[PDB]
Design a protein around this ligand. Structure first.
Ligand SMILES: *[C@@H]1O[C@H](CO)[C@@H](O[C@@H]2O[C@H](CO)[C@@H](O)[C@H](O)[C@H]2NC(C)=O)[C@H](O)[C@H]1NC(C)=O
Ligand SMILES: *[C@@H]1O[C@H](CO)[C@@H](O[C@@H]2O[C@H](CO)[C@@H](O)[C@H](O)[C@H]2NC(C)=O)[C@H](O)[C@H]1NC(C)=O
Ligand SMILES: *[C@@H]1O[C@H](CO)[C@@H](O)[C@H](O)[C@H]1NC(C)=O
Ligand SMILES: *[C@@H]1O[C@H](CO)[C@@H](O)[C@H](O)[C@H]1NC(C)=O
Length: 157
């Protein structure tokens, strides 16, 4: 049985994309995906993935800089419902600076500025309003889920 998303040790927020679907964003020290893969092996999975990230980018109004940087990322599918896990490299100042131009960083920024949970540190990046965010959280988890089920992690596969 899956762990809870809504816990005192987690920071969480739900994005309501559709009329009945959405994304549960969870900052946690709990790993949900146990492999190193993100198999977007078909055009359908490939669009669900882009739809998930665009929804985040639109909603949080993320103007993400081009720094040629990446977060370690796994993803999985459970009957059309995607799970994305970021293995965050934001634990120390250099890491935040080197993983600044990522979607995961934008989420951290949003959590920080919106005060959605957890304490963070913003390092001035090179570009405008964009800050490189430090956090002690090990994982950022994004799951296609409903509001009724958003407080418990869904099963990835
Ligand atoms: C999540 O894990 C980290 C360790 O990876 C916990 O500990 C923090 O780690 C950072 C970086 O090593 C330190 O700067 C902090 O001082 C540590 N804090 C504590 C209390 O140990 C972190 O606390 C964990 N968070 C949760 C909510 O479990
Ligand atoms: C993110 O971290 C988790 C946990 O540290 C990784 O999960 C491990 O993945 C390896 C595959 O190389 C397995 O052999 C281990 O059993 C997994 N451990 C656990 C606790 O699940 C995960 O692969 C990492 N993802 C990325 C993209 O780096
Ligand atoms: C992803 O694909 C690789 C190679 O095709 C395979 O070894 C791996 O098991 C796949 N992962 C998942 C979660 O299906
Ligand atoms: C969640 O999955 C369903 C079915 O795959 C899809 O219709 C819906 O758009 C997805 N939600 C998001 C936010 O991508």
């Amino acid at each position: 049985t899956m762990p809870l998303s809504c816990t005192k040790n987690n920071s969480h927020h739900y994005i309501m994309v559709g009329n009945e679907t959405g994304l549960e964003l969870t900052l946690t020290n709990t790993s949900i995906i146990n492999h190193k893969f993100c198999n977007l092996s078909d055009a359908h999975k490939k669009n669900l993935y882009d739809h998930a990230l665009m929804s985040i980018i639109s909603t949080f109004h993320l103007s993400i800089p081009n720094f040629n940087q990446y977060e370690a990322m796994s993803c999985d599918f459970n009957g059309g419902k995607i799970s994305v896990q970021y293995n965050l490299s934001h634990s120390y100042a250099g890491d935040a600076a080197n993983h600044c131009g990522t979607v995961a960083n934008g989420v951290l920024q949003t959590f920080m500025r919106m005060a959605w949970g957890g304490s963070y540190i913003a390092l001035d990046s090179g570009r405008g309003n964009w800050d490189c965010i430090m956090t002690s959280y090990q994982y950022l988890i994004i799951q296609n889920t409903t509001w009724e089920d958003h407080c418990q992690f869904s099963r990835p596969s």
